[PDB]
Amino acid sequence: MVKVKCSELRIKDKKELTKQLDELKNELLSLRVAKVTGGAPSKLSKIRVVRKAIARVYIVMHQKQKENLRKVFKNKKYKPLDLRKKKTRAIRKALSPRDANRKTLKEIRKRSVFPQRKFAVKA
Template identity: 60%
Template sequence: LGAAVGTMAKIKAHELRGKNKADLLAQLKDLKQELSALRVAKVTGGAPNKLSKIKVVRKGIARVLTVVSQKTREALKEEYKGKKYVPLDLRVKKTRAIRRRLTKAQANATTEKA
């Protein structure tokens, strides 16, 4: 908990992106421990600065989780690059109509109507 106490400064997402997954998960664990300690302080009537820190820590946890999921998605996208079948959640969303539209090659292959 000693290292996590100094996390009053907001965690920056661009700094998190430079870390590997193991470091991120370790930081996540520290933040969660700190949050539980702050919640205990809240119940026992802790200092007001500790109560205001709860929000900062929660946002920090959210940032770490976001970066972890983004890295995971990027790795999966790289893995499926050039493959015939891609999982639904990695495909482009667009709209249903656009997804069912002819591809550019197919549209150009059809002859113009007279």
């Protein structure tokens, strides 16, 4: 009733959250019937409110699931696909920025011999 905020919900546990969630879907079923029955209060207009109220419970309950899956997948090669940095397809296939800059021993020997000097050919 007093608006349930994700700023508040993030401290609550996944045990409380679904218990907090269940009293909103169970509240929402009592309002669907309250719509078709001719809700005699002008509107119990919770079905705008209590519908989006659930949507901010499912988001926090999924963020806590998704951040918790990332630290169990740190220092493991083969993260799952949906933890693998989407950027595009085009930059995903192309030569990781270390690997573009690999230098053949001809290239890192002709670099270090002759530095490009800083002159001024001026009369």
